[PDB]
Structures are given as C-alpha cells and as structure tokens.
Symmetry: D2
Subunit: 388 residues, 4 copies
C-alpha cells in the first residue's frame, strides 16, 4: 500500500490517492470526517480553522460502501480559496497582480528560505503554500482509511498530550487504549488527566497574549497488535524505525521515541528489559512494557507506545530577526496567519501517521488483496502465536 | 545508492554489497579499516572484541585505489567461526549434533522469542545469529565508503557520548566538528570532556560487578552540509525523517532527536527558532542551532546535530525471568557472551549510518554517475547558495 | 519523479498526482489537452469518444503558468457518470438495485473473471471499471507533463502505426521524428504513408459490421536523446528494460522490441551491430540504428526506436464463449460498449508512457530540483559527450 | 524479496546477496550448481567456459540445509582471475603499470563507449568488466533459489530455443513444461526437436568459420501457476510488464512477447481471445492459450508463455568500423576467437530471471515470512480459486 498527498494551503483543494487497499473494506465518508474534525480542533487553534469545515469527497476506489481494491481518491476543498483566486491561479495573470502577497521575508523555523534556495524561487509563498501543515489534513484522511483496516482487525489506537509547553501530564497507571481514547476525547487539550485542563488553557492564553508559541510531546498507543510485524534481518525492515521516519516527517516534529525512550539511556539493564511470561490462557506476554511494543524491530504483542516531540509553531506574532531576500537587509520575519499552539491537532496527525505505517506493515506481512483473506490470515497468525 | 548487508554472528563471514557509488572515488581498505577498528573499541567491551580483528577485503567495484561505479563488495571474516563449524554449517549435519548451543530460553530485550514466532523456529539461535549487532560491522563499512564521499565534498563528521548510563556529559560550547572528533578519540568512552572519564570507567566496572548493563545517548554532528538536501513537498522526502529511520534501526536504539530535540517540547517558540543572518562574506547563516541543521525537512547549512538513545544491552550476566519454549515453564533467560555496555561502539555505528543516509541524499540530489560531475554539481550549488 | 493514476471508467472523474517535477517548468492546461484530444481520436473509435471531451483541471503544484516543485494534481471529468449515478455511487444503496449492469458472464481476454477471483468479487464490473482503458487518459496527462520537460531539453517524440490488423505499412527510410509526427497526424489511422489508408478504413468497417476487433503494432521514436541515460551495472538500471515494463503495462499490449527487435534473432552479428563513427563536427555517432538507440541498457545518442504490439480489443459484439459465474453454465460473454479498434489511440498512450519513463530517467541522472539547474546540467553533459 | 549481484568478469569472484527469502526453505549448493552448469553449456560456447568450473559457496542465510530468513550470500570464484592480479587489483599500483591491457577501442554493439562517456573513464576496461555477461552467472544463482520456492509450490519452469540464427524450430503441439525441460536438455542447443540437432550444430560451425555470430529467440514456459498474481489496478503492478523488464534486462536481449506476442497484432479478436470454460472436475480453465497466461496483467492459470529475442554476440571476426578513443582515428575491430553464439546459455539466464520475478510476485501476494505459512496460503488460495 502506498499513497501521495497534494494541494496548497491556499489552493482550490487538497487531494490524496491511496493505491493498494484491499478490496472489500467497508468505508464511508463519515469514517474520514470524524478524524478530519478532530484534526481542526484543540484549544489554541483559531482563524483558518473557523473558516474551514473539512469533509471528504471520494471520487474513486469506493463503491456502495466498500473499497474495490482500485486506487482511492479523496478530496477536501479549501473554502478559503475564493479569497486567493488570482494569487493562487494555476494560469498566468498579468505581471502587475503577481506582486500580491509575495513573500521576501523568510520566517525563522519554517521552510521559506531553504525552499527558496533549493527550488530557486523569487516568491517564498511558493515554498509556504506546500510546506504548510494544511497538508496534514490529507495525512489524517489517509490514516482514517488505515484505521478502518486496523478496526476490522480488532486493533485500537489513541493519542494524548503528555507534555504541553513544559507541563508534564501525570497519566494514570494502566489505562487501556480504549480508556486513553475516551478520556482524551473529553479534553480540549487531549490530556487524559484534566485537573490540569484549566491550567494548560490559561497558559496557552498567556503564551498567546505574550505573543509566543509552545509545542510539547504527544503519545500514540496501539493495542491488539499481532506479533512479528517488522523484521530484524535488514535495517530497513524494522517497524520501529519505519514509524520513526513517519513521526519525524510530521511538520514541526523534532524527535521520536519508543517505550521508555530517551529515559532508557538513564537506567540500568535490569530496569529496562521486559520479562517474558506465559499462561495457558493467553500464551506469551511481558511483565512490563518499557520497550513500548518492540523487540528487534518487531512487534512483541504489548501495546505500541511511541512519542513525538513537536517544537513550538515557528510563526510568532512578535516576529524574530530575518533577512529580506531582495535587499539582503535584516528585518523582522513576515507575519502569516497562525496560532499560539497546535499540539492536540498534531497528536491527531501523529495517530493517523502511526496507523498508516502499521496498516502498511500488516498489508505487507499478510495475504491482503481482499479483506476476507486478510482477516483470515490474521486470525490464523494470531492462533499460531497464541499456541507457540 | 543502495546496499544490503549479510552474515551471521558465528557464520564464516559478513558481506556487504553497495550499488550506485559514483565511479572515480578514491577508496582503500585502510579507509574502511580505520572505522572497523573504532567500532570494536570503547571501555566496557570484552570477549569477541579481542578475538576479532576486523578488516575488509574488496572483491568488486574497486580498482587501483578508486571506485569504478560497479557494485562494491566488501567481506569481513569471522575469526570466531572456527569454533562453530558444525553448529553454523550451511549444509545438513547429523541430527544428534543439532542440539548444540540450541536456544530454547529466549532473552527479554532481544529478538529471540518474536523472531522464533515470526519465522517459526524451534531453535532460537536462528534468531540470534542475524539479530546480533555483529551486523553493525558491515553497516560501519558501508558508512566508511559514504564518509569518503563526504570528505571529497569538504564535509566532516564526528560522534561523542553525551549521556552515559544517566551521567550527562558537560559539552563545551562552540567546538568545531574537527575538535569533537579529536577530543572524543582521546577518551576510552568517547566523551569530549575527560573530567568524568575515570568516573564513567569506574561506573562501568560497578555495573559489570553489579551484573547489569547501561546504555546512553550518543550525538552525531555533521559540518559543511550543503543547503536544500531533503524536501518538504512530500513526507517521505524529509531528510531529518530519513535519518530518524536509520538511527532507530540501529540495534538497541529506542529514540532519535534533532537539535534541541525533546527539550523543544519544553520551551517557547521565541526560545527555539534560529534567527536568520546574512553577510557578504558568508551568505545566509543562523544565529543559533536549536533546530540542529533542519528546517522543513531540509538542511539549512548549519551543522546537523542528531542524537540517538541506546537502551542498555539486553543480555544480563544476572539473567532476568523468561519461559522455556519447549515446556512453557518459567526459567531464567539464556546468558550469551556480551559486555556491560557497548555505547562508544554504538556511537561509531550511528556516525556511519548518518553518513550513509547523507551520502545517499547527496547522490539523489546531484548529477553523480562519476565523482567529477558530482564535485562540479556540488561546487556550483554551493556558489548559488552563497549568492542567493 | 513518481505518480499515481486513479478513477473508474464510469465514476465521477479521473485523477492523477505527479510528485517530483522540478520547479520552474512552464505548463498550461493546453499542453495537456492537446494530447488528451489526440488520444480520443483514430478512425474506428465511437461511442464514449462522442460523449467525453477530455480536458484537464489543475488543482495543485502549478501557479501562474509554471510548476512549483510541489505535487501536481490533474482531474479529467467523466461526463458519462451522470448515467451511472446509482450503479457507481460511493455510498451503499438498496440491495436489489445492485443487479443493475452487474457482470456475471466474463469476457475472454479482459480482466473480468481473474479480477473477480483475485479480489473476491460477486459483480465483475468491479474488475471492469478500473481495468478499463479509460485510465490511459491520465497516463497521457502525465506523459504530457513529461513531454514538456523533454521539449525544454530539446528532445522530440512521435508515434505511428506500422501494422494495422495485419496490414503492414511500407515506411519510407530515414524519416526524422518530426517528419513522423507530421505525416502520422495527417492520417486518420496514424500511418505515415497513406497508400493503404482507405484499405485500412474499409477493413475496420468490415471488422465492425462482423462484430469482431483488431489491434496492431505501433512505433514510438525519440530524438535528441542525451548519451548515457540508463546503466549496465545492475539489471534494473537498464533503461531499455525500464521502457519494456512501461510499454507492456499498457492495456492490450502483449510485447515490446527495440531497434530491429525480434528480427535481430534472425540475422547475423555483422548485419546487426551499429558501427561507431567519429567526426570533429558531430562527435561520436553510429552508422546505422539497428540497436534502436541502446547499448548496454544505455542511450547511445541515436534515435530511441521502440515498437509495442497491441492485441485486438477483447470485447466483441459477436461475443465468444464464457461461463455464468452464478450457475457455472456455459454462456456468451457479456457485450459492453466498445470499439472495433483503438490502435491509433494506443499509439498516443505509448508515446506518453515512453516520454514519462525517459523524463523519469533524466530526473534521476541529473540535478533536477528546478528547471534551471536541470537545463545547465544537461547542457554540460552534452558538452562533455560531444568533446569526449 | 530483493537482491544485488556484484563482481567483474576478471575480478576475483562474483557475489550476490538475496534479502527476503522465507525461513524454512530446503536449499543446498547442488540446487544452485545444477543451474550454473547449464549456464556454462551450449554448443558454440568456447574459451572461458572450459576454464571456469562454476560452483557456489554459501556464507550466510543457510543453516543445516535450510534457509533461516536472513540475507543469503553466494559466491562464485573466477578461476581466470589468476592471469589478471595486477590489472584488476583493488589497491593502487605504480603509475607505469596501470596502462596494462588498457582499452581504448570500443566494440560496436557493446557497452564500452557509452559507459566510458557516462562514467568518464579513460580506460574502457572499467566498463567492460562489469557489463560482461559473466554477471549472468549470479543472476542464474539467484534464479535457482527462486526456482526452489516455485518447486515447493508445485510449479514448474523450462526454456527452449525456438529460433536459432533465423532457423525456426518446428515445435510439436502442446508440449508440457516437463516435456520441454526433458527434451531441451537432451540437446546441446536446447531445442526440443532433435531431427534438427546436427543441422544447427553444423550451422553454428558455419557461422564460426564465416567469422560471424548468431542470436535467436528463446521461450520460457511456466506451469502450475496460481491465479491472480499481478494486478490491473496500477500499471506497475501488472506481472506481464514486470516480466518484460526482467527479460529485456538480460544482456543482448532486444524484445519480449507473451503468448502469440507480436503475431497478435496481425489477427482478429475472435482468433486471439482465449474462451473461458468451467468443469466440476477442474473448475475454470481456458480453451486455448493465445494470451500466454495473462489477462489484465494477472495470471489466469494457463501456462505462462514468454519469449525474448537475443541479438547476436557483438564481437565478430568480420570487421566492424570503430574509433580509437585516444586518437579519434578510425580502426577496424576484429576478434579472431569469439564464440559464434551463446543462445542456449541465454535461455538458462532467461528461465532464471523469469523464475525470479515470479517468486518475487508470489512472496508479495502471499503471507511469506516462512515456508510453512507460504505453502498454507498458496494451498488455501488454490482451493478458493478452484471453488469459485
Ligand atoms: C497541526 C499542525 C499545525 C501547524 N500550524 C502552524 C501554524 O499555524 N503556523 C506555523 O508557523 N507553523 C505551523 N505548524 C508548523 C509548521 O508547518 C512547520 O514548523 C514548518 O513547515 C517547518 O517544518 P519543520 O518544523 O518540521 O522543520 C503546524 C504543524 C502542525 C503539525
Ligand atoms: C531515572 C532518570 C530518568 C531521566 N530521564 C530522562 C529523559 O528521559 N530525558 C531527559 O532529557 N532527561 C532525563 N533524565 C535527566 C533528568 O531529568 C535531569 O537530571 C533533571 O531534569 C535536572 O536537570 P538539570 O540539572 O538540567 O536541572 C533523567 C534522570 C534520571 C535520574
Ligand atoms: C555496537 C552494539 C553492540 C551490542 N552488543 C550487545 C551485546 O553484547 N549483547 C546484547 O544482548 N546486545 C547487544 N547489542 C544490542 C542487541 O543487539 C539488541 O538489543 C537486540 O538485537 C534487540 O534489538 P532492539 O534492542 O533494537 O529491540 C548491541 C548493540 C550495538 C549497537
Ligand atoms: C526547561 C525544561 C526542559 C526539560 N527537558 C526535558 C527533556 O528534554 N526531556 C525529558 O525527558 N525531560 C525534560 N524535562 C524534565 C526534567 O528532566 C525533570 O527531570 C522532570 O521534571 C522529571 O522529574 P520527575 O520525573 O522525577 O518528576 C525538562 C524540564 C524543564 C523544566
Ligand atoms: C486506447 C485503448 C482502448 C481500448 N478500448 C477497449 C474497448 O473498447 N473494449 C475492450 O474490451 N478493451 C479495450 N481496450 C483493451 C482492454 O483495456 C484490455 O485488453 C484489458 O484491460 C485486458 O488487459 P490486457 O489486454 O493488457 O491483458 C483498449 C485498450 C486501449 C489502449
Ligand atoms: C549468456 C550470454 C553470453 C554472452 N557472451 C558474449 C560474448 O562472448 N561476447 C560478446 O560480445 N557478447 C556476449 N554476450 C552479449 C553481451 O553481453 C551484450 O550484447 C553487451 O553487454 C551489450 O548489452 P546489450 O546487447 O544488452 O545492449 C553474452 C550475453 C549472454 C546473455
Ligand atoms: C490550515 C491549517 O494550518 C495552517 C498551518 C500553517 C502552517 O505554516 O504550517 C498556517 C496557517 O494556515 P493559514 O496561514 O491559512 O492560517 C495554519 O492555519 C490546517 O491545519 O488545516
Ligand atoms: C560481535 C559483536 O557483538 C555481539 C553482539 C551481541 C548481540 O546480541 O547484539 C552479542 C555478542 O556477540 P557474542 O555473544 O559473539 O560475543 C556481542 O559481542 C560485535 O560488535 O562485533
Ligand atoms: C473510455 C475509453 O475506453 C473504454 C475502454 C473500454 C475498455 O474495456 O478498456 C470500454 C469503453 O469504455 P465504455 O464501455 O464507456 O464505452 C472504452 O471506450 C477511453 O479510451 O477513454
Ligand atoms: C565469461 C562468460 O561470458 C563472457 C561474456 C562476454 C561478454 O561480453 O558478455 C565475454 C566473454 O568473456 P571473455 O571475452 O573473458 O571470454 C564471455 O566469455 C560467462 O558466461 O561466464
């Protein structure tokens, strides 16, 4: 299974094509819209998010509620585009109008300047329009399709904020994936423990009044995973490593870690390995989950636990120093529309990207031209695993 | 450029094939051997590291001291194989001899059990032989070819330990890559500040007496990096993300971060973006390097700064709890030859892997059938960059 | 450069995304539409070709006349979809309405039955809608983008029919690419010598009235190609082999050959090899082009000459024998809407696919994040080639 | 599954690494060696083939007679290397010695000149050593591993010469794969009709005394093929097209065709489609096999029938004009002893590459981390197919 996303922030619309989903999967637009809606939200996002109402339009690969195995195409319109018809026209317009919203003041922390050097642009809007996170809308759309697959295979996934601009959220011990998703869904900041709900909001508004931005750490958990997805025989077959690329490819993300993660570099061997247990009732399991679901680049059957750090949004309403690309003189950075933080939204993109890599791995490991054989292949493999 | 590594820990030899290096790159067995030697070192490694004397043998693609563009084949013999001629024989032997060194007690933390389930093994040695970090020897070897290409393009790379089993190393501000390489080579634990050298060493010794293991955090730095390598136009073209997959693919790595890394989730935007500066003498630069060389998934010209966390080595001489796979009874894990720590060596592995990806990215971006045209494409791009 | 095509024959629309085209390439909807029009033509096409008027819509990656380097999305609407609103709805509909246009009598030669076994379909139109050649419309839209790149690099391409249902064309010797393009465009069956045009039209009418079909052989020729695209150093880098996959992947194609092709298996070495020549004026050239522009899987600078055989359309109006997948009784294949032949269109698809593969090979060989750098590299390479 | 081949014709040895073969496959050196012996054979092959005695050495991935799922490494020594130790040494040597056997006279029909332009060589030996068909030895080694997988899945493969230097071999009607395999290797020229055996040998001799070369056409046939391998959903998923690239990648191959092949462009649809039949005994079948086992890029369950044309060996005793690359002066190329033909050996290479691609497709289609699950999946899939 593979895919490509396309579209510009202020273009007419976004598009994604997914090639390789099995035939037979029940799939509706509501299956996608629920996640699209979750991605637009989170306390701290404003502006564009109150202008868009992201919903999907399928134009291929889905027939009468089920996929057919053909490429699936999903669209999401940009309502805002009616204000950028000339500026973002595909066709040429007269010289004289091109100057409009032309960007020559790169913003620190964004792709503007380097995208201009690489692609040799005279207008950095040509870097901005694609590098913008509006694109994550289609990543979530692809992840919602991936999630339908995981749901048919009795797997569960959830995401929650565990660090918000420095505030470490004390998560209760031994929550199920279902509990994580339900608690988190009740918060406007995706935290499982809310006595901090009002405290974090206040802070986002401080930061907001203060004219600054914050980021944090988001955690994705996956339950019911089959054992032996990924492989140690070659470096690029390791599933944790595959997930690492996908997480870090999310706009603003600067790191990814599994289970204890970086803490594992501060502890002893005996405090980190997860002992192996067996029962006639359940077959193999592990006493603890410090490795976050992976042994040797492979799923061991415990929950997958991965965290990603999102740096603060680069756009500051209180600029920062930059340089004017036409004069080479220092100046403040351009101020494009943005928010004090988009962390909860980033955690939804993270959930979608993890689900997507997972679904890719499942489709590669098991017979999967169609849902029936895949579901059969997975049941058989879970029976084998249980009785090993 | 692409490659495959092969070989078992106690098989006769390790092998690697590299396809796609440009013709005309000066390359010698000593260019490789220097790094193989580093990989074998580091206070805390014993056993095998005194038996093996890792050196390469070229058998294709190198002629008269230069690559030809054809596939390069490198071999590294396993001197230890002499003690395993029967056990690791490619051809069938007497059934009665097959139980030798057979493993039925998986080790927590290692690939034993899950590899056994995935591949349907009755002898967990079949997992161990290939999941062993003995394979990282060939990754270092491929890395040494990649480093020669970086050297030809005026780039420099180094690695050092910045956290050793929880002891954080105090790194002097403003060191060049060359100083980090030089100071680290004077330490038995690869730290650039030897004030904790004896303390780290005695800590290792304690760990070993205590019968436990420790990991840490290694940092790789790359200097003189061309701008605009990597792209934001699609997620899987982001170079930070490609490095992420490669770093976490290293045995025992549970995480990866760039620049400030996870600490960016604890700061404000104004304390994280790197301001943009310009001078007639140097072109564009950045005031600070909190982003570790990456904006928008692309190199910004600042030093690339990446860290990976190595969990503690799973094999404890004081074995943890497990299960006998033939009887399903609880039992202590198998105790195989291992060391209290392999962090310094992991650092070298990371250095090679980072270099590998980077050379791959350079070979994608520039005309690179031969070194001549590659060097010219790179100089020309550097000139463009400098004058943007 | 990579791309995906998507869409069903009777769904709402077709879509394609191309990822990786350099920034800076002039591109308009007319650059695409000219080839979409060619593809709908050819004496012998009717039905659908009378309902559709294929024209593109760009929704991403194109701004004010040029590419930006971001993913390019193209749509082609299916006007006919208004007749299939229920039959092809993405949303589920009442069970009884699903019998509408349901295929249970598979057509010999088409993807019907096999797709039904592979994907576990009960309705074989689910095989039909995606396997149908309506999809070639988007492969031609991608080729048109590829062809714009080839034109900025001073390359030319043309296609022509050389066999039309067994009638071989007597092709004058030593025509240029441009001559081929011009002469074939003045013919209603894309033949460059019209002595048999009326005979071929009369034959097509005959096949039609008899409820039969015909295919033939088309030839694509590419001029001005750079030397050394492709490589012999690994089998999958050979450019003639890469083209071979792309040509056979066109619907109804059953084979591909280069230069003399299969005739080379009937002649002696001395009658096939192309002698090497050199002059201060032209640099290296070849006396003849029996090899069709390739030596060792690499372009040698002569015209690329490649031929593909298109088998006859499978859907015959006097249907062949098949089986009712519901009762297992013998029954005549279903008769869907089809032409007696679509060879001239198939020629345009083949021109597009060849140009695509070649653009991809060029983008891989040369620095090509943007058009300016790509043009400078190709000029430089041509300079080195001429003066070798 | 993927693999890389490496080595020079006059280097010390050839090497291949295959990654992704399921654990559990019985495999021995003789499994490979049988094919390697066939590949050295064929009337018309002389020189080298009498010195070389190709046998494989396994150095990884094979233990006690079975694969383990890790990367497999195979070596084949070049006995001829002994006469080239200086010339082909990896390490640098005195400048005065580097001109030994330097090549500056490109052979028409070979990779020489174009390779030296591409890779900017002064010595065309660096093109020649790797472009040589000596490399096909490792492609046949790889194909032998693939063939072992096919045999475990009850599939059979064979190759025979159908056209020899223009002599069309009259093949009996409807030979099975096993018949073709048996008859063909009773022949020193791989033909299934031995009334023409002496005739072809004499013709080969005649060509040789005439100082010329011949090529021809080889047909590979595959039986017991599962249905539904390959897909129509995207062009690059079609298995006929994947086989096309593999076949045209063989040195000297200039075309590939399936079933009736190019003859399908001369016939009518009624004379080409294969009618679909069903019986309670055997399930679905076809009345004829004009399509060569493919419908919509997918296997239909009839025997795969593919033919490739091999141009004649380019090196001749008859003169062919070329140019001296150091002087730009014309010269006549002539080789006193060259083989007149390598067609029967090319047929072995064709069988191997075909077998390889099929194994790859099978590994992709079905659950295949280990042989046991693969077998189970294939069995389940044939039961579904038969009972559709
Ligand atoms: C959900 C989400 C929303 C974002 N919103 C904004 C925003 O409003 N303003 C901004 O400057 N960056 C925003 N970002 C961050 C930028 O897209 C990103 O920092 C930039 O493209 C550079 O890529 P990099 O930070 O990964 O290096 C957002 C990211 C995510 C995941
Ligand atoms: C058991 C343990 C676990 C820790 N885990 C991490 C970690 O995962 N990430 C990190 O950045 N620091 C980690 N450290 C470092 C401590 O957080 C650090 O010493 C502390 O925050 C004080 O920092 P300061 O000296 O910079 O104020 C940990 C320390 C210990 C003892
Ligand atoms: C240089 C290096 C040396 C290692 N040496 C050991 C060792 O002696 N014993 C051990 O159990 N693990 C060692 N490992 C770690 C194991 O290979 C590894 O934990 C195991 O394959 C499971 O992979 P994972 O930890 O990535 O999940 C080493 C890793 C590296 C990078
Ligand atoms: C400014 C700041 C930065 C921090 N950076 C990190 C970090 O990068 N990684 C991490 O794991 N913890 C980080 N933390 C947490 C501290 O390391 C500290 O040890 C933490 O509060 C844990 O203490 P506890 O786990 O005993 O409550 C940071 C804390 C602060 C105030
Ligand atoms: C331009 C074009 C038009 C075609 N139109 C038709 C048609 O009208 N009816 C039909 O049965 N097949 C048509 N085909 C062929 C089928 O799509 C094709 O034979 C089928 O998908 C099975 O694929 P295969 O022939 O490659 O095995 C056409 C092919 C091309 C290139
Ligand atoms: C089995 C085999 C043996 C070959 N032996 C010879 C040979 O002895 N001499 C020769 O000139 N070409 C020989 N060839 C052909 C060349 O390798 C080939 O023409 C050349 O590398 C250029 O590639 P191309 O013909 O695919 O363009 C052989 C090919 C094969 C498959
Ligand atoms: C549109 C989204 O976020 C955008 C991401 C973003 C940026 O630079 O990354 C900039 C803003 O877009 P705009 O300037 O139109 O307000 C964000 O709002 C979205 O998530 O759908
Ligand atoms: C051989 C190396 O490391 C090995 C990696 C390792 C493991 O499980 O990862 C186990 C030990 O191997 P053995 O049991 O033979 O001593 C390590 O020493 C090496 O780095 O070259
Ligand atoms: C639509 C095209 O070709 C179609 C390919 C086709 C088939 O089996 O391949 C069937 C017909 O479509 P329909 O049944 O609507 O008339 C063809 O005309 C086209 O070239 O644009
Ligand atoms: C060595 C093989 O074939 C070789 C292929 C070949 C060529 O250009 O392709 C040239 C000859 O090599 P040389 O000139 O040393 O004899 C062939 O013999 C072989 O099949 O193993």
């Amino acid at each position: 299974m593979r895919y490509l996303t396309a579209g510009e922030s202020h273009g007419p619309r976004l598009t994604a094509i997914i090639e390789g989903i099995p035939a037979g999967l029940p799939l509706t637009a509501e299956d996608i819209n629920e996640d699209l809606r979750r991605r637009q939200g989170g306390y701290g996002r404003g502006g564009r998010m109150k202008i868009e109402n992201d919903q999907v339009v399928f134009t291929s690969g889905v027939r009468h509620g089920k996929t057919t195995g053909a490429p699936i195409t999903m669209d999401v319109i940009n309502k805002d585009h009616q204000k950028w018809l000339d500026i973002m026209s595909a066709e040429d317009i007269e010289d004289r109008l091109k100057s409009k919203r032309k960007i020559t003041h790169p913003r620190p922390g964004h792709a503007d300047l380097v995208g201009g050097i690489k692609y040799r642009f005279d207008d950095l809007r040509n870097s901005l329009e694609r590098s913008s996170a509006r694109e994550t809308t289609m990543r979530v759309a692809v992840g919602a399709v991936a999630k339908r697959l995981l749901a048919e295979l009795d797997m569960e996934i959830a995401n929650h904020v565990v660090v918000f601009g420095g505030k470490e959220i004390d998560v209760p011990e031994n929550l199920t994936v279902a509990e994580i998703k339900q608690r988190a869904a009740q918060s406007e900041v995706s935290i499982v423990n809310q006595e901090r709900e009002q405290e974090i909001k206040d802070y986002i508004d401080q930061i907001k009044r203060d004219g600054d931005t914050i980021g944090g750490v988001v955690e994705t958990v996956v339950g019911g995973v089959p054992v032996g997805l990924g492989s140690y025989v070659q470096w690029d077959r390791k599933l944790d490593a595959r997930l690492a690329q996908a997480v870090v490819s999310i706009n603003a993300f600067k790191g990814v870690e599994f289970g204890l993660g970086f803490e594992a570099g501060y502890r002893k061997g005996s405090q980190v390995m997860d002992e192996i247990l067996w029962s006639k009732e359940d077959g193999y399991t592990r006493r603890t989950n410090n490795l976050g679901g992976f042994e040797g680049g492979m799923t061991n059957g415990q929950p997958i636990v991965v965290r990603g750090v999102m740096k603060p949004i680069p756009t500051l309403y209180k600029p920062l120093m930059s340089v004017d690309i036409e004069t080479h003189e220092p100046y403040k950075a351009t101020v494009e529309r943005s928010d004090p933080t988009a962390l909860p939204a980033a955690g939804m993109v993270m959930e979608a990207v993890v689900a997507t890599v997972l679904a890719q791995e499942i489709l590669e490991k098991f017979s999967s031209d169609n849902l029936e054989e895949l579901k059969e292949a997975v049941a058989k493999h879970r029976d084998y695993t249980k009785n090993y």
